[PDB]
Amino acid sequence: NAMKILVTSGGTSEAIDSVRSITNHSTGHLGKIITETLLSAGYEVCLITTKRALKPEPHPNLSIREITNTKDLLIEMQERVQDYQVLIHSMAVSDYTPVYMTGLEEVQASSNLKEFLSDEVQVLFLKKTPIISLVKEWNPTIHLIGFKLLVDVTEDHLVDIARKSLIKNQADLIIANDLTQISADQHRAIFVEKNQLQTVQTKEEIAELLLEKIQAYHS
Template sequence: MSVAGKRILLGVTGSISAYKSALLIRLLIKAGADVQVIMTESAKAFITPLTLATLSKRPVLSTFVADDSGRWNNHVDLGLWADALIVAPASAHTLARCATGLCDDLLSAVYLSARCPVFFAPAMDVDMYQHPSTVENLRRIKSFGNYIIQAEHGELASGLIGEGRLAEPDTIMNVLNLFFKKNVMPETEIRSRKDTFAGKQVLITAGPTQEPIDPVRYISNHSTGKMGYAIANAFAKAGASVTLVSGPTALQLPDPSIERIDVRSAQEMFNATERAFPDADVVILNAAVADYTPAHPADQKIKKNESTFALELVKTIDIAATLGRQKRAGQLLMGFALETNNERDNALKKLHQKNLDWIVLNSLRDAGAGFGHDTNKITVIDRKEKTYEFTLKSKEEVAQDLVNLIADTLEFEKKPSL
């Protein structure tokens, strides 16, 4: 099943991206859907009702009263008629009304009356999208059983770069087709870019390393590997051939196509990564590799005989810096920086000293980010120090953001200059 034969209510609200609603209507009509457009008054400043009525082959509705005869647009009937209601673009104002149940126009009344699945595709500037009130409104809307088609990352009408762009009409169509086909809408599938990385080799490191003190003890950290595994899975879904060099973790690979190489120490991780590095097109160094290792690990268990115990440590090999020196033209090398203070300065230092193309910054001062969580909050910085800010999300969503960001970059680099 798909949208063919489905009755779709399309809510269009006041956003510069309202022009994309015309493209979405064309795709829906071409796919065989029956489309009824409902516009807010503010939306009419961005696109005319005549345009959307012509494309949808139905008069556009925007008020309760249709004309002077007293005929009215029955919001209850509309809510019962539809197989799905999608609000695209969904402005911050409309999100706030729907999150709190305010009902002062036809669209919000239809939303409160709808018994069908409801999809919201937000569109606004990056600061508005990341504002705590918008984040909370989206959380509330989702908690009511509605679906959120996340805003995409890119250049916005203000000139800023970040999250807030309305999802492309093709993406929204894929969401609807997936929903009607499976009656589910897993967020990691919504934004997947199938076959984007077909033919590409992607190398990822994940998890902690363990540096042996003796046969039963080791030095390690709190990394679980969740972020690296999510990245590997996202790239595999996007069509890449993925090699995952993994430190010790209890995680299982969800995608059997991924080649997993298990290692323990920092030296073993370096050896495995260096072997796979020459063939890789994209390399993402997510593993939490130990900076130091015991100089003289004991062959037998060390007994607790003395009141104090001194352990001599030596530096491990710097995997990122070594690969940065070996990097060939066309390879993309991304590193991670988990910081607790002077976060941006430390991340920029790592970016430039190790010859990386991207650095992904985590701060342990951000609630829900870093080791052990199912969520993460990242800032991505490129070689020119252009910065991309992302909100707190599940690690699966963060992984998809990285796939999208890298895919957009590669697509941009392929375009001929004017």
């Protein structure tokens, strides 16, 4: 019976205080197209997404879980990851988490900035969040696909960053893309693997190639 795929899409938020949050914007359009492609291929999909993200139409093999933050996402991954054979992580999540916000004068006065890690101008300190790098621990046979979005970089740098992420997350595939190469009718991406690259030029092509990769991976 049906193979089970976990897909994330949309963008998380992280509160700074009672008034402010760091928020991530992604319409989750590509996640929606990918999910639709997988549903049509006969896969069972659990889509972990956010409030306003684009969603596929209801489908008997589709379930949707809305979350808000990194905590929620971490919880889902621990709960579900052992039960799924593929994870495609396309949700925008901040790699840095807000820790402390204070006036510049306090910061200026400090003899040691590492202290802040435990009024004209404000200063916000964020620390590395470190996730997906724990997924292969929890289910070392899950097929792990992630994305890397950079902005106005060389394609060599893009591949290099994607490859580092591939090694770090023990991912099987990183789909790398540059904001400046995505437009209304084009979406250049590089499918980055340990020992090969492939480029595609549109969202439909990303979804179809990903399907091919998933089918080949699972025979």
